Amino acid sequence: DPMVSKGEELFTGVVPILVELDGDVNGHKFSVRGEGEGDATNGKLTLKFICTTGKLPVPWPTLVTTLVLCFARYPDHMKQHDFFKSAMPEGYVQERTISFKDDGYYKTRAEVKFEGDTLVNRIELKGIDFKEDGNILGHKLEYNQNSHNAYITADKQKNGIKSNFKIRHNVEDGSVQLADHYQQNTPIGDGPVLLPDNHYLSTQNKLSKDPNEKRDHMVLLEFVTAAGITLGMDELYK
C-alpha cells in the first residue's frame, strides 16, 4: 500500500511518474507535462514529455536534468547513502541554478513527492539573461544528451545534499555549450533522512520522437546508477 509505505520500500517495483514544469523565458510562458514510469531496481526511466502551450522556446536537451533521482539504482552496499528515497513519501525540494556559459541561466525549484501511487515532480523554472540568437533561444543544440557523472555531497547543517556538475550540450556548429549546474536538495517533511557519504550518480540517456505525435515533445529513455563507493567490495576479490 503506497499510502503507508516508507522510504526505499516505495521503490521495490515500477512506479508511475508525472512531471509538471511551468517555465518563463524571453517573454514565453510555457508548460511541459511528462508521463511514464520509473524503476529503481534497474534505474530505468521511460517518459514522454509534451509542451502543452505550443512550441518549446528552448531546446529539449536543456530541460533533461530539470525534468527524479529517487529512481537511481543504488547498489546494495551503498543503500545507506540514498537520500532521495529516504525522504519519501513526503519528498524533497530540488533547487538548481543552471548557467549556460556565454549565455543566460535557469533558476529551478521543484518538489518531488508521492501523491497516491504516483511519484510527482513539479517544477517552476525561470530563464534569465539569454541571448535572443544564442544557442538556447536560437535552437542550435543537437537533439541528444551525453552521459554524465554528478557527484553528491551531504550538507548536514541544511539536512540535505548538494551537487555541482557540468552538462555538455553538443552544438550544431561542432562546438559544445556548457551548462553549469549547482543543485541543493532538502526534505519537505520532518522525518529523518539518510545523509550520504560522497559518491556519484552515472547517467545515460536516449532521446527520440513519437512518430504519431504532432505536439512539440521529447521521448526519453534514461538510466541512473549510483557509484563510487566500492573498496569494501573490491577487497572481497583480492
Alpha carbons 46 and 224: distance in angstroms, whole number: 12
Please give the residue range of the domain that contains residue 144. Answer: 7-237
Number of independent structural domains in the chain = 1
The strand pair at 217-227 and 199-208 is best described as antiparallel
Where would I find the beta strands (DSSP E) of the chain?
15-25, 28-39, 44-51, 92-100, 105-115, 118-128, 149-155, 160-170, 176-187, 199-208, 217-227
- Interacting residues of 203 by C-beta distance below 8 A, sequence separation 6+: 147, 148, 149, 150, 222, 223, 224
Q: Give me the amino acid identity at 79.
A: K
Nearest-Å Rg of the Cα atoms of the chain is 18
User: Does residue 21 sit within a domain?
Assistant: yes
Least Cα distance to 117 among 199, 18, 33, 198 occurs for 18
Are 104 and 98 within 8 A, CB to CB?
A: no
CA distance to 33, 59, 176, per residue, from 172 (Å)? 27, 12, 9
Q: Which residues of 117-128 are buried (b: 16+ CB within 10 A; e: fewer)?
A: eebbbbbebebe
Domain for residue 22, yes or no?
A: yes
Residue 121 located in a structural domain = yes
**Closest CA relative to residue 42, chosen from 12, 10, 85, 17:** 12
Residue 81 lies in a domain: yes
- Is 124 inside a domain boundary? yes
Find cell 550538507 and name the residue. Answer: 155
Q: Give the residue among 92, 95, 97 at the shortest CA–CA distance from 70.
A: 92
Rounded to an integer, what distance in angstroms lies between the CA atom of residue 108 and that of residue 87? 20
Q: What is the CATH number of the domain that holds 107?
A: 2.40.155.10
Burial of 12 (0-12, 13-18, 19+ CB in 10 A): exposed
In a domain, 2, yes or no: no
Considering the domain boundaries, does residue 1 fall inside one? no
CA distances from 130 to 67, 98, 140, 178 (A): 20, 12, 13, 14
Beta strands 118-128 and 15-25 are: parallel
Residue of 14, 9, 149 lying closest to 79 (CA atoms): 9
Helix (H, G, I), strand (E, B) or coil at 181: strand
Does 214 reside within a domain? yes
Q: Residues for the chain: how many in total?
A: 238
The C-alpha atoms of residue 114 and residue 209 are separated, in whole angstroms, by: 28
**Residue with the three cell numbers 504516483:** 118
| Triad 69, 130, 33: Cα angle to 5° | 40
CA distance 11 to 119: 10
Contact yes or no for 145/207 (Cβ under 8 A):
yes
